[PDB]
């Protein structure tokens, strides 16, 4: 006959929530006081004869790292000086000495080191953060924008925002999978799949309407959406030819430190020379080619419509224009010059504007003040992809259009994380056998059970301790993995199969569970498929095995009672 038989280490998995952890490569935020050194090389492994599926949209990694970025940001900002006292009347005039409403000059009373010593003090501001004190007289009167809403903070000058190419690593007993196919829509089946231990260095970058740096799609232009039919759902398009772009602030600036309190110093802005609003440069000649290619790709999905782009539909500043950071300076460039039915063969330049008070995310409690940076500044970068949103009304003219959008920071990281995916491991397999009792991690999954059984020891040994505001996470991870492993070991022990991997036992196989051709089961089948039906009778099997062990032990003792 056949007999229930256990195997430990079978290569099967199941998706589930988890908590990855950071991995980095001398004062930056993330690397300092966080993140372990990255693995120099990916221990990538190819798994043929393995088909799978992915759902990039409904994913946990993106969301998981969302609040992680938020928390690291806030914590880094925690120790810096609060600018509370500055919410004082602002007697202001027009800037310059040789009306340029882009910036206003101001002066105001304020507090010295000594409580009862008050001094006047001036500073220049961009018109954005300033507001009229009220709809009242004294037009010179103004107040900072946030004050009637909430306070803000002057970031610690030393810290910087240069996005480090962070890596993510999973905890033991879990595996990270990549769909090799370079034309995956982002939601669907995949056939060429590999597995790695840590995610490739991804920079925590932030932008609207643009995907600065990142990566191209070497194959072609890529389009993906949860459902392009549903106009509301966002669309993301990735380029396969990165487009250079530059921006700069053509001004010579420097900061005046003001001891607002005893040990707390604000950094007012000031200028040396004349004032010229920041701007950008881009080779629209380059732009047109990718535009036309993506237009053809869109037509492919819409064989009876035209294609065009207009400026942002209108709304909050950051959404309307393209916002981003440049070496820790916030820029907002009006993008009407790009999304148009016509460009030139010449370089294109854009007028941008600069804000000093920033609502990094909609909740205002985290309102930040950007300290001025000395001297002019310039950032060069490139575009790899962009976010688009469809109009949503079927014009009789069929002039289908899309507009820039964004604002959902999760989508930015999604744009890359779509590749990855996370699963756990359940190395306890059960199968019938005639017996009766008395590295390339997970690679063998590419074969059948009887054949694949040889290398179970690799999976067994690897899955334990390969790893070696923040601590809590990794501590939870390690403890939980250890608990799981101990549970499995103990279950093996109770079944009397400790110190074994192909332990035979004394419970005959039951027909009801299944009646497949054993030859196929051992040579034509794979565990990922074998487990599916067996799942049903798992608990019955466990009870039978436990009873077998109990009766064996008790009978042994009885016969050896004397």
């Amino acid at each position: 006959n056949l007999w229930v038989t256990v195997y430990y280490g079978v290569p099967v998995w199941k998706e589930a929530k988890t908590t990855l952890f950071c991995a980095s490569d001398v004062h930056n935020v993330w690397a300092t006081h966080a993140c372990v050194p990255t693995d120099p090389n990916p221990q990538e492994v190819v798994l043929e004869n393995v088909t799978e599926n992915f759902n990039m949209w409904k994913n946990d990694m993106v969301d998981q790292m969302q609040e992680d970025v938020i928390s690291i940001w806030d914590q880094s900002l925690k120790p810096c000086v609060k600018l509370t006292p500055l919410c004082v009347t602002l007697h202001c005039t027009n800037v310059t000495i040789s009306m340029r409403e882009e910036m206003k000059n101001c002066s105001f009373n304020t507090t010295t080191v000594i409580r009862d010593k008050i001094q006047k003090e001036y500073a220049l501001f961009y018109k954005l953060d300033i507001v009229p004190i009220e709809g009242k007289n004294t037009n010179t009167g103004y107040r900072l924008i946030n004050c009637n809403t909430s306070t803000c903070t002057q970031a610690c000058p030393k810290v910087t925002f240069d996005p480090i190419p962070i890596h993510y690593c999973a905890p033991a007993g879990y595996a990270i999978l990549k769909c090799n196919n370079k034309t995956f829509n982002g939601k669907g089946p995949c056939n060429n799949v590999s597995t790695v231990q840590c995610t490739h260095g991804i920079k925590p970058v932030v932008s609207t309407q643009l995907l600065l740096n990142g990566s191209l799609a070497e194959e072609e232009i890529v389009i993906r959406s949860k459902n392009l039919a549903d106009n509301a759902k966002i669309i993301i398009v990735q380029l396969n030819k990165s487009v250079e772009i530059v921006c700069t602030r053509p001004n010579n600036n420097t900061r005046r430190s003001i001891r607002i309190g005893p040990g707390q110093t604000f950094y007012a802005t000031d200028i040396i020379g004349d004032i010229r609003q920041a701007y950008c440069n881009i080779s629209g000649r380059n732009w047109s080619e990718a535009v036309n290619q993506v237009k053809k790709k869109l037509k492919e999905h819409f064989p009876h419509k035209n294609i065009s782009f207009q400026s942002s539909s209108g709304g909050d500043l950051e959404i309307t224009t393209h916002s981003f950071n440049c070496g820790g300076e916030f820029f907002y460039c009006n993008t009407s010059g790009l999304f148009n039915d016509t460009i030139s063969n010449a370089t294109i330049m854009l007028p941008c504007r600069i804000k000093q008070i920033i609502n990094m995310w909609q909740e205002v409690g985290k309102c930040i003040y950007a300290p001025p940076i000395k001297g002019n500044i310039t950032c060069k970068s490139d575009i790899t992809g962009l976010l688009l949103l469809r109009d949503g009304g079927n014009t009789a003219n069929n002039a289908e259009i899309f507009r820039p959008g964004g604002g959902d920071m999760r989508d930015n990281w999604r744009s890359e994380l779509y590749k990855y995916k996370v699963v756990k491991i359940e190395p306890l397999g059960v199968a019938p056998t005639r017996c009766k009792r008395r590295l390339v991690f997970l690679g063998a999954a590419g074969s059948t059970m009887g054949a694949a059984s040889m290398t179970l020891t690799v999976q067994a040994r690897n899955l334990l301790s390969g790893i070696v505001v923040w601590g809590i996470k990794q501590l939870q991870a390690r403890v939980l993995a250890v608990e799981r492993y101990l549970r499995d070991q103990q279950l093996l022990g109770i079944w009397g199969c400790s110190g074994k991997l192909i332990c035979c036992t004394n419970v005959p196989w039951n027909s009801s569970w299944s009646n497949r051709n054993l030859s196929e089961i051992w040579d034509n089948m794979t565990w990922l498929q074998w487990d599916k039906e067996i799942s049903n009778y798992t608990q019955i099997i466990y009870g039978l095995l436990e009873e077998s062990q109990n009766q064996q032990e008790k009978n042994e003792q009885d016969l050896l009672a004397l």
């Epitope: 459902n227 039919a229 759902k233 999905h301 909050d316 959404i319 909609q362 949503g392 959008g405 604002g407």
Partner: antibody, heavy 119, light 104 residues
Framework: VQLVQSGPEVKEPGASVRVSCKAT????????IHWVRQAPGQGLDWMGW????????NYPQKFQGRVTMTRDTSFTTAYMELNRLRSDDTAVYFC??????????????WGQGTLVTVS | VMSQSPSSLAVSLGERITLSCKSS?????????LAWYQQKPGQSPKLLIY???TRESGVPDRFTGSGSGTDFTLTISSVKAEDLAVYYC?????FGGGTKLEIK
Amino acid sequence: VQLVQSGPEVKEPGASVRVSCKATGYTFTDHFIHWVRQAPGQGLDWMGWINPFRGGTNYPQKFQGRVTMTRDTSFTTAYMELNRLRSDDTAVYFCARGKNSDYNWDFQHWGQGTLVTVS
Amino acid sequence: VMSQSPSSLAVSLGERITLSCKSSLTLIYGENYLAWYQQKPGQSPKLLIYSTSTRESGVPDRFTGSGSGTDFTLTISSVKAEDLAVYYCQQYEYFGGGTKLEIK
């Protein structure tokens, strides 16, 4: 969760009319808010949505350049504004919200509905 | 355009009736769905069917929805007095021609 509007409106041709939509009972910044205009004896037609999260919007080409949508987080209230009035405008308007974020295409909750007319 | 025909019918109470919503999208891609909304004259419309045949909570089951792909149907086993009202189908921004039911 309740949806409220302001009183009906009457205005001369060629002007612009504003209407309000007050919401309550849940996170005002988690669900697209849709607008639908119904003239007497006509089918419900879509005018556009606004996402409270960051003031993003959208409109069909029929109304583009004629509509304006805005939000106030303080009072969790949406504002619509239609310019260059003309008889067609005269009709009822309903602001509605969707049961689930994922589908974001149903309408469980509806304001009482508000009528506007020209002249 | 999504079509709801006929515009009405000389119904009588207590009869099983079924009206057809025929779509026109038939393009790109889960799978497309439908929404049967109720509305009596002078009040806010109401949700009756969502998805394709999952009727809304609290609705008498005689109200029903069915169909696939392009052909869908609102259905009633036995029309009651209060049930005489107007109804529409909605897959996306667009809406059907609707239908209202009454007597001679």
